[PDB]
Design a protein around this ligand. Structure first.
Ligand SMILES: CCCCCCCCCCCCCCCC(=O)OC[C@H](COP(=O)([O-])OCC[N+](C)(C)C)OC(=O)CCCCCCCCCCCCCCC
Ligand SMILES: CCCCCCCCCCCCCCCC(=O)OC[C@H](COP(=O)([O-])OCC[N+](C)(C)C)OC(=O)CCCCCCCCCCCCCCC
Ligand SMILES: CCCCCCCCCCCCCCCC(=O)OC[C@H](COP(=O)([O-])OCC[N+](C)(C)C)OC(=O)CCCCCCCCCCCCCCC
Ligand SMILES: CCCCCCCCCCCCCCCC(=O)OC[C@H](COP(=O)([O-])OCC[N+](C)(C)C)OC(=O)CCCCCCCCCCCCCCC
Ligand SMILES: CC(C)CCC[C@@H](C)[C@H]1CC[C@H]2[C@@H]3CC=C4C[C@@H](OC(=O)CCC(=O)O)CC[C@]4(C)[C@H]3CC[C@]12C
Ligand SMILES: CC(C)CCC[C@@H](C)[C@H]1CC[C@H]2[C@@H]3CC=C4C[C@@H](OC(=O)CCC(=O)O)CC[C@]4(C)[C@H]3CC[C@]12C
Ligand SMILES: CC(C)CCC[C@@H](C)[C@H]1CC[C@H]2[C@@H]3CC=C4C[C@@H](OC(=O)CCC(=O)O)CC[C@]4(C)[C@H]3CC[C@]12C
Ligand SMILES: CC(C)CCC[C@@H](C)[C@H]1CC[C@H]2[C@@H]3CC=C4C[C@@H](OC(=O)CCC(=O)O)CC[C@]4(C)[C@H]3CC[C@]12C
Ligand SMILES: CC[C@H]1NC(=O)N(c2ccc(Oc3ccc(C)c(OC)c3)nc2)C1=O
Ligand SMILES: CC[C@H]1NC(=O)N(c2ccc(Oc3ccc(C)c(OC)c3)nc2)C1=O
Ligand SMILES: CC[C@H]1NC(=O)N(c2ccc(Oc3ccc(C)c(OC)c3)nc2)C1=O
Ligand SMILES: CC[C@H]1NC(=O)N(c2ccc(Oc3ccc(C)c(OC)c3)nc2)C1=O
Ligand SMILES: [K+]
Ligand SMILES: [K+]
Ligand SMILES: [K+]
Ligand SMILES: [K+]
Ligand SMILES: [K+]
Ligand SMILES: [Zn+2]
Ligand SMILES: [Zn+2]
Ligand SMILES: [Zn+2]
Ligand SMILES: [Zn+2]
Lengths: 395, 395, 395, 395
């Protein structure tokens, strides 16, 4: 009576029926029922029930039954213990805080990480290795995107933008850069039309940020061509705004870098560390405010109440400029454009540097470990390709 | 004789009675008593005592009995082993140093982390979500605190503080900033009176730093209003001191940020890493002193004993200024306002930079791991809300 | 029927024959064959098969058989579990991603880390301790390499390179430096000839980068001596190019430092962290481009469309210069030669500093842990010299 | 025959006699002897030998016997496994490299961390809490050491060192600083004589660096007093040298800080990380040399062979100055006194910054983990005071 022997994989586990009955509604409680002999795998010769499971972790499940707190064995994986808990009927949300992080770790990382020739036309954007012409198409896209970025950067330069005499010496960009941009634009509009020919799930295609960027980058050239026909002052202002807008041409490099695994892992880490990024932002804002105020007040210790020369011997004429000084000092950047020149200001600056180091190194390690785990998991996915299951399940 | 079998959860542990008698006053010693058969769960058919506990950790407790040193199994938690030690009667303070840190880790983290409508009136400060008007009240407090901080920072500026001609061109702050501050102050005094209406445990309410800050921030406006009535030079000096005191208005943001979990975790980490902060302070002070002296003496190698031009070609006219140079160089800030200009001074500066890196990276990682553990524990508290126990203890 | 008992090192493991038959072609499946009694170690008295292996890990192998996913026990080593898997016939490539990194860790680190007197002549380069004259030879090589590097650095100086009056005041290097270089060169050519005397595997000897460097460093002196005979303008240009080429003399220090274990470990880490170095390069390039464009556009907010004074109050005259500013700001270097001077530019600079910190601290920790593991393994190789096996294997 | 059952703590371990005989000279081999029944604890009823030890680790020792490689269980401590190996006769130096670091970790940390009233006189230096007058004596030493350091730093200042008119306006230090130094010196010489009164083990007392520092700091005042009597030019030169020597007064603070546990741990870490410090030094030297040469040659790309204006537009007039630039850039200090001004020089500077970050972060983490382990161990020594053994060993 009250003595029940559970044989888990050849290991005899002995406990009381009241111990099993403690947790109701589970398989071991059903074992603690007067019909378990007729409801389970029981042999009368040994008076023991046989379960074909892992005894090393069944020890810990029975220890949960005994004590009342569910822990996870540190000598097996979270997934292994989770499968055993699922079989034995235990809720995985009963696990103690001392086990929760190491238990829900691989699962959290995995959840963070995760018309005849119309397919032939849609293969234009597809993996360059997945076809023969796709390789050349992708290489041409690489070359044209790089050339467009280079032409943009050269357009911002001064050697290619001279001041020719005109209605005064107005500075105009050399026209060969515009011709190169025109060639790039005709290629890019060919590619965009070829990809728009095949647009399954047009809602998702429009919602796609990469194609949004491509259209936004292709608009300004045509808007400029149309604008130049009309010679008005408002046309000139819109032309200048279009020149500002042309910065979207450098965003086309994310199309090229989208396939890099480290970039995808970084995106996953950014999406999963929102709380830590907010923590860093709040720490920086509080430190910047406090240290800007402190340096403003410390750089005029002993100054007269209304002497205009109070702010004449300092870089800290106000608190908003101390904001910039404080961020530069806390990041250990130290440009040197503004620094304290008084003993109290130097004390405050030393405090600011140390506090910046500490409150930068608080959440950055959390984000770093998140990235490390996600990168390792993705790399394992790359090192271990899916293969034959090799395991034939029992019917 | 002398052979005793302990059956712990179906696992037969065999040891000598003298081995059990080694540690007196404990449950296993009582088992090694001639009456254990009449004092414990003993069956004569098998000549074994049955205990319904964890055998994997009972192995380690018996190993303590055998060898004489108590260790902790690395395949279970500190709390699990602590519960087993509490049941078996072993003192948790006998654990070896090789186990103490990993054993007393979750426990240390947990100890670091932890009149009809008078409640309706006291709900004014309560959680904004805990009521309907509290949401609007908290949003108004947010807006007014931010506006007061903005008005303070603008008051320190020069665009809003012109030099109008008066008894000379005295610089006076624009009065619209003072009017905005007055509106903020009337709102804040309404809030303070409404919270003072309900003040249970007035000793604790006075001791509360947040309300102390609120009163200290609300005093200066009224003190200024009263002071302006009396036109005296001492009144002007007290007015200037009140202008200095007005910096307490930026401390009201801690009322808003008090509810952030990362801020509470940071406070816990600061309170728990006092020794490491003192270690960092001592390291920095020793390095600053040594390197200031070394750079002072190295920047005049070969100089004449009393030539006044000895200090003319150097930024290091003395040692106290080398203190500032040394802290800036050791934090890898590098403002550049003062640097060595001699070969020996550059050697000393390289030494200073490397030593600063090392003696900054010594205790900062300890503080960082403390923060990481506390943050993870608090986050687990947030991921796993308290629910039904699900465990019905035996009577 | 269907009940089979496996005795692994005195521990009875019980499972179903269908469970063993799940994974075909392995030793346990052969055990689940009607002839296992005649094909294995079986005794009819106990109806159990005996295997003389580790039961604690056999539990996990049988758990793989039971559930269908292969994991690794966290309480043993990867090599231990690998040997057990090799014995039991399980493929090591079936291990789950949650186990792959901690399993294939030591193995990955190990794979990263790994004519009468003609031998007497070839002993000239050999380990200095491996002979008597080799010690003096290696010390002489040390002294001469250091002297050559010192003479190079002094040659670049201005105190040793005066402007003597000649066909004008042409600046010529003092001839005593050239004489010292000549002595060093005659020693080095003696050493090179002595090592070329014994050149086993001449293909590998030529492919050896150290000897390539030695020959490239010894060529310029003789090329200069031959060139000075011919007095032509093209001869002067080739002489200047040879002066540029003389920088290869500082590369001879890698011959001296080749034997340092930390340098070999660093080479292994560089070879094994190519993916992480590419990740760092891509992150830096993307950040530099984005932040250079952003600072260029933010430093002229509100500027006129074609006012030439738009770029007059800024260090950021174009985007390529912003590349340099961005790298300096992201590395937290902060030279201060160019910084933002506008509120929007300061916002962008704060963003740049924080983003640089984060995207520098993402892959650098991965590289750091790689180096740490490899260094620890190499140091263990140094702490535990190979000794007698002490284990006599059974025939 | 050939079948032997070992009963280790109630757990039956079964193996072959040849398996035990594999490792000769050990206790299990002696068990595999025809007399083991008469040489060990054997009962004929069960045909098993009983050992009262830990079965979980005996499994791993027997696995060493079986396979031939000795590993350490990850679910127990190094000290626990070491005690078991010592009992079973296995050499601890047979452990595999995959186990050596985690096994020899606590032991390595522990080895790194470790005439009537003549005792009354010698109590003058003793722990201030260990007596009543010692508290006041130590506080007086604190005050006098701090005052001496302050007087030194003030002596280096210019406000306290005016140029009074004398044989010209020679700058002489104010005499009140010298009087304060004289008071400090008389106190310190009293303390030194009182400590020299009781000098057990005079060889060790002389070898003690703290007392060496105290004597060296007390000499210069008396040497100055004696020197001032003789008015000679050589006397003035020796006086100036004594002024230089007076820097030893700041070294007296190590007497005060010697008792801090973090300082003792830092000393242990410095003594135990000599290899890593040499690694850091070699990495820095190689990087500094390479990048100084590279920046020197990159800052004059396209310059004429002998144009004196080649070095006129650069901070890098030679390679030795590039050494300083390179160290400043690699430490991410960035003073800004010298920076590249050419596109190639900026490329080289970006390379230098990244390489400096990487080769600083390579061995610094190793040193940091060493310090962390030693600090944790020392802190455990402080958290767990030695108490009653509580364990009565068997005779
Ligand atoms: C043990 C030693 C105890 C200290 C003994 C000496 C303390 C008193 C020194 C005498 C100070 C004095 O009488 O005159 C005040 C001077 C004025 O110097 P100043 O206000 O800084 O202006 C000139 C600075 N320029 C612009 C040239 C860069 O002030 C100065 O010369 C510069 C201020 C030096 C003190 C503050 C430096 C920053 C402290 C950082 C170190 C703390 C790190 C701990 C962590
Ligand atoms: C292998 C190579 C072995 C070294 C061979 C060359 C060593 C001797 C070079 C000749 C030095 C000489 O004769 O003249 C002394 C010059 C004087 O230069 P200065 O005292 O620094 O003043 C000018 C500096 N301004 C102000 C322009 C910035 O000094 C100088 O030009 C600058 C000093 C250069 C040496 C110190 C630089 C800092 C050392 C950091 C590198 C160590 C890092 C290891 C970790
Ligand atoms: C809570 C506080 C809320 C903020 C309340 C105040 C905000 C408005 C302040 C008034 C600004 C104004 O009206 O004038 C604009 C001025 C012009 O100043 P400027 O454009 O920078 O030019 C002078 C700077 N020199 C060259 C001398 C270095 O701008 C300035 O004075 C300097 C710009 C200050 C703001 C940007 C500083 C950089 C922000 C870093 C902090 C963010 C960190 C979060 C992480
Ligand atoms: C995708 C984009 C591809 C790049 C397209 C543009 C590349 C070509 C730009 C045109 C360059 C040119 O024609 O003129 C050369 C100029 C001369 O400028 P300078 O030699 O540096 O002198 C002036 C600099 N002051 C002293 C004012 C600071 O050079 C310059 O303006 C400054 C040099 C800019 C390039 C080097 C900057 C440093 C590179 C760091 C970024 C790499 C980080 C990767 C990790
Ligand atoms: C400081 C430097 C390193 C830039 C800042 C890094 C991140 C803020 C950005 C830059 C590049 C971005 C990546 C560029 C491209 C992609 C592909 C993108 O996938 C697609 O859009 C594919 C088509 C689709 O399904 O929409 C997913 C996000 C990701 C990884 C981005 C995630 C966010 C990243 C890492
Ligand atoms: C460099 C920047 C990040 C500022 C420095 C950070 C810490 C020095 C300070 C700033 C904000 C502080 C927090 C602001 C508000 C609170 C709420 C406070 O709780 C209350 O006062 C609630 C009412 C009460 O019971 O008293 C407890 C401390 C804490 C977490 C503070 C702990 C110490 C913190 C983290
Ligand atoms: C920033 C500083 C630290 C320099 C950058 C470090 C690495 C980029 C370089 C510098 C020195 C190099 C090492 C110098 C010498 C050798 C010996 C070399 O071995 C031989 O060539 C021996 C003969 C042969 O078999 O070829 C193997 C590479 C290694 C470790 C090199 C690996 C790459 C290292 C670490
Ligand atoms: C950059 C700053 C942090 C200074 C550099 C730190 C270390 C290079 C030095 C500074 C203070 C030194 C400590 C000062 C005093 C002592 C006490 C000393 O003990 C005694 O001399 C006691 C009497 C004796 O038995 O000799 C042992 C070394 C230690 C810990 C020293 C170890 C080396 C330390 C940590
Ligand atoms: C027009 C008044 C002018 N005169 C003067 O002596 N002061 C002053 C007075 C007291 C003070 O106190 C400090 C000191 C240091 C810190 C960090 C601090 O943080 C807010 C406050 N700071 C300046 C003036 O501003
Ligand atoms: C008025 C004397 C004037 N003349 C002179 O030659 N010196 C001098 C002498 C010796 C010295 O030694 C050093 C060198 C380097 C360091 C780091 C050091 O640390 C304390 C001490 N330093 C300077 C003078 O100060
Ligand atoms: C000749 C036109 C001249 N006038 C003007 O007002 N601008 C301008 C307009 C809008 C803008 O928008 C921003 C603002 C910030 C950032 C970071 C940004 O990133 C690309 C873009 N930046 C500048 C001019 O350049
Ligand atoms: C008096 C000759 C003068 N003229 C000239 O054009 N040069 C030159 C030639 C080639 C070169 O090559 C490089 C480039 C970059 C690096 C990093 C490098 O590392 C050693 C070498 N560097 C300079 C001169 O010095
Ligand atoms: K840093
Ligand atoms: K810096
Ligand atoms: K800097
Ligand atoms: K700087
Ligand atoms: K830095
Ligand atoms: Zn737990
Ligand atoms: Zn232990
Ligand atoms: Zn697993
Ligand atoms: Zn191992």
């Amino acid at each position: 009576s009250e003595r029940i022997v559970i044989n888990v994989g050849g290991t005899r586990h002995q406990t009381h029926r009241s111990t099993l009955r403690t947790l109701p509604g589970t398989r071991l409680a059903w074992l603690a029922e007067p019909d378990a002999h007729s409801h389970f795998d029981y042999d009368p010769r040994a008076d023991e029930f046989f379960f074909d499971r892992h005894p090393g972790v069944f020890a810990h499940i029975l220890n949960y039954y005994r004590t009342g707190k569910l822990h996870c064995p540190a000598d097996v994986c979270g997934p292994l213990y989770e499968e055993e808990l699922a079989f034995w009927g235990i809720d995985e949300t009963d696990v103690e805080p001392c086990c929760w992080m190491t238990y829900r770790q691989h699962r959290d990382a995995e959840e963070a990480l995760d018309r005849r020739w119309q397919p032939r036309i849609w293969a234009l954007f597809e993996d360059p290795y997945s076809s023969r012409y796709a390789r050349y198409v992708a290489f041409a896209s690489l070359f044209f995107i790089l050339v467009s970025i280079t032409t943009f950067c050269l357009e911002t330069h001064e050697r290619f933008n001279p001041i020719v005499n005109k209605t005064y010496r107005e500075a105009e960009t050399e026209a060969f850069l515009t011709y190169i941009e025109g060639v790039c634009v005709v290629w890019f509009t060919f590619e965009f039309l070829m990809r728009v020919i095949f647009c399954p799930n047009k809602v998702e295609f429009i919602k796609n940020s990469l194609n949004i960027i491509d259209f936004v980058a292709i608009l300004p050239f045509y808007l400029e061509v149309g604008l130049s026909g009309l010679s008005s002052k408002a046309a000139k202002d819109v032309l200048g705004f279009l020149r500002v807008v042309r910065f979207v041409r450098i965003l086309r490099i994310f199309k090229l870098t989208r396939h890099f695994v480290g970039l995808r892992v970084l995106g996953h880490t950014l999406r999963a560390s929102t709380n830590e990024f907010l923590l860093l932002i709040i720490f920086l804002a509080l430190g910047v405010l406090i240290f800007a105020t402190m340096i403003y007040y410390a750089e005029r210790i002993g100054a007269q109440p209304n002497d205009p020369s109070a702010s004449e011997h300092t870089h800290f004429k106000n608190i908003p400029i101390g904001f910039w000084w404080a961020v530069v000092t806390m990041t250990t950047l130290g440009y040197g454009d503004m620094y304290p020149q008084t003993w109290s200001g130097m004390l405050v600056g030393a405090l600011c540097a140390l506090a910046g180091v500490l409150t930068i190194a608080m959440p950055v390690p959390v984000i770093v470990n998140n990235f490390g785990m996600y990168y390792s998991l993705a790399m394992a996915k790359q090192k271990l390709p899916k293969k034959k299951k090799k395991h034939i399940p029992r019917p």
